[PDB]
Amino acid sequence: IDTAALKEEVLKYMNRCSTQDLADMTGCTLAEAEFMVAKRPFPDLESALVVKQPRPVIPKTPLGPRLVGICMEIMRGYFVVDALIRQCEQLGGKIQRGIEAWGLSNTATSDEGETSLVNFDQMKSFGTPANSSFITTPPASFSPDIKLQDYQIIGINWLYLLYELKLAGILADEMGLGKTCQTIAFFSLLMDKNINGPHLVIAPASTMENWLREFAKFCPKLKIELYYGSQVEREEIRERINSNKDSYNVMLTTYRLAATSKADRLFLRNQKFNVCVYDEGHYLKNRASERYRHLMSIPADFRVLLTGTPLQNNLKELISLLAFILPHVFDYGLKSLDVIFTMKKSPESDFERALLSEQRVSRAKMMMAPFVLRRKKSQVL
Numbered sequence: 179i180d181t182a183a184l185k186e187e188v189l190k191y192m193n194r195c196s197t198q199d200l201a202d203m204t205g206c207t208l209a210e211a212e213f214m215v216a217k218r219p220f221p222d223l224e225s226a227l228v229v230k231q232p233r234p235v236i237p238k239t240p241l242g243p244r245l246v247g248i249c250m251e252i253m254r255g256y257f258v259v260d261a262l263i264r265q266c267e268q269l270g271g272k273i274q275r276g277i278e279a280w281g282l283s284n285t286a287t288s289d290e291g292e293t294s295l296v297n298f299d300q301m302k303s304f305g306t307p308a309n310s311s312f313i314t315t316p317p318a319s320f321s322p323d324i325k326l327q328d329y330q331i332i333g334i335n336w337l338y339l340l341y342e343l344k345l346a347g348i349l350a351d352e353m354g355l356g357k358t359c360q361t362i363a364f365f366s367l368l369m370d371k372n373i374n375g376p377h378l379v380i381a382p383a384s385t386m387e388n389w390l391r392e393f394a395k396f397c398p399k400l401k402i403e404l405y406y407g408s409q410v411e412r413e414e415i416r417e418r419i420n421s422n423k424d425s426y427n428v429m430l431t432t433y434r435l436a437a438t439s440k441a442d443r444l445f446l447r448n449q450k451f452n453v454c455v456y457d458e459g460h461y462l463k464n465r466a467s468e469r470y471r472h473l474m475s476i477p478a479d480f481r482v483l484l485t486g487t488p489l490q491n492n493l494k495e496l497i498s499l500l501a502f503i504l505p506h507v508f509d510y511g512l513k514s515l516d517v518i519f520t521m522k523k524s525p526e527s528d529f530e531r532a533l534l535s536e537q538r539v540s541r542a543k544m545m546m547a548p549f550v551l552r553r554k555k556s557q558v559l
Contacts, residue, residue, distance in 0.1 A: 179257050188249045189223055191534075202532040204248040205521055206241075214245055251517045256534055258514045259493075262500045262507065263542050269345055269504070270548035276339045277548075280312040282332070285557070291489040291543035292350060292552040295332045311339075319366035319399050326363055329558045333360040334367045336551050337482065341368075341453070346481040346503040350552040353486040358385075358392050361455055361484065365428060366397040368453070375427040376403075377453040378446065378478065380436045385457060389430055405431040405442075416445050433461065437472040446476050454478035458485065465498035465512075466519035474501070474508045488552055489543055493535045494519060496542045503549045 192214075195203070200211040213231055220226045229242030277284070277293070281301055286294040298314065306312055312335050316326045326334075333349065337360075340347040351357050365377060381389055386406070393402045403426040405415055412435070419426075429449065435442050454476060456462055461469045462483050483502065489495075497515060501507045521529040529535055 179254065184250055184253050184257075185223055187253050188246065189220060189226075191249060191253070192220055192226055192246070193218055195533075198527075199531075199533050200245070201527040202529060203252055203534065204245050205527055205529070206245060206248075208526060210241055210245070213241060248517075251514075252534075254514045255518045256538065258512065259497060259500075259518075259538050259542070262497070262504060263538065263545050265504055265507075266500060266542065266545040266549070269343070270545055272343055273340065273345070273548035276343065277336075280310050280335070280339075281307055282312065286547070286552070288544040288547040289540075291547045292550040293336075293548055294553055294557065295329070295336065295551070296553060296557050297328050298332060299328075311335075313367070317363060317366040317370045319369040319397060320363055321396050321398065324359075324396050326359075327356075327558065329553050330356060330360045330363060333551060334364045337364045338367055340549070341480045344480075344505060346483075346505075346549065348483045348485065348499070348503065348550045350485050350488060350550050352552075352554045354555060355553060355558065357484045357486075358389065358457070359396055361457075361482070362392055362396045362400070364482075365400055365453070369397075369399065369427070373452065375400075375452055376425075376449055377428045377455070378436075378449070378451040378476070379428060379430050379455045379457060380433055380459070380473070381430065381457040383432050383434070386430065386432065389457075393428070393430075400427040402426065403429045405429055405435060405445075409439075412442065416441075433459075433469070433473070436476065437469050443472060443475070451476065451478045453480045453482065455482045455484065459483045460485070460487075462502050463490075463495045463498050465501055465515075466494070470498065489546060489550060491539050491543070493530055493539050493542075496539060496546065499546065500542065503546070 197208060197211040197215045200206065200214060201208050214229060217229045223246060226246050227242045230240035282295055282298050284293050284295055286292050298312070301312065301314065306314060314331060320326070337347055337349070349357050349360065379389060390402065390404065393400055403419065405412065436446060437443065456473065459473070461467060461473055464470060481502065489499070497518070501512065518529065523530065
């Protein structure tokens with residue numbers, strides 16, 4: 179991150195921006211942006227730094243320095259966002275090549291910020307190549323009485339592809355397409371391969387009898403440990419589990435329990451989970467939250483987020499997901515991004531509407547697309 183490059187970028191921006199774009203980016207008022215803008219062209223940054231609004235006419239930080247300083251903090255942040263997007267470009271390239279080495283097709287384009295793999299008919303007809311890792315059959319651990327749809331066989335193969343690449347996945351199928359069922363089938367796929375957990379599933383209380391029901395119905399072979407109840411009940415659960423009496427495959431808990439209080443937090447810390455699934459984990463969309471840091475602080479080899487929503491055109495959300503899916507980023511500070519998450523929107527200005535923000539939204543949505551599997555009802559009916 180070159181100081182001279184920063185100063186250059188800021189000088190050019192200050193000379194280019196609209197008044198409203200300047201308010202959007204710096205959080206200043208529209209009259210401040212108007213004054214600023216009317217003092218330009220700026221031949222150098224010093225010329226911007228002498229700008230100050232007049233003292234009242236007779237009937238504590240001057241404008242110039244304040245805006246130049248904010249723009250340089252922001253440019254710093256954007257440069258960090260760009261590095262995140264380039265890493266995402268790298269690793270998603272590896273996802274795309276793994277998919278192409280299956281021998282299967284995608285209906286979506288990157289700009290839609292997802293992948294849509296709907297069927298494997300041509301592998302059905304002509305067969306799976308000797309060089310392909312795709313598994314067309316249900317897992318042997320999976321309940322024989324439950325039929326997996328073709329798009330769900332794809333789901334568990336895709337999840338395992340991303341597991342192998344040491345990445346992270348977002349499963350964003352439309353509501354009703356059995357994301358919970360595909361998760362459980364993924365667990366049973368791992369179990370075929372002698373990968374047995376423990377794994378964690380964090381869910382809203384609203385869905386936890388459903389997770390228990392679906393575990394029992396779809397893959398009864400998984401041993402499930404429910405981490406729920408009173409502080410005291412939870413404590414005896416920890417007592418019972420820490421003594422390795424009956425090892426388990428999947429632990430089920432809620433976001434409240436998983437994040438709120440010290441004792442639960444480091445119990446989950448010490449479990450050393452392999453897969454960690456965040457069901458309806460919209461908290462992962464907001465890195466500027468205590469809950470986020472606690473969710474992401476739980477150690478896990480492979481993180482999966484389940485959601486019914488495609489990626490939104492919101493830079494803050496996309497940065498939060500970039501730190502979710504990119505290896506070893508969350509352990510970095512990302513302090514240079516702090517300033518972006520402190521810019522509160524208002525009627526006068528919104529950092530999301532700054533042109534440089536929008537450009538990063540477009541670019542990131544495009545590069546995050548191989549990390550997002552999304553099928554719609556209208557595709558799989």
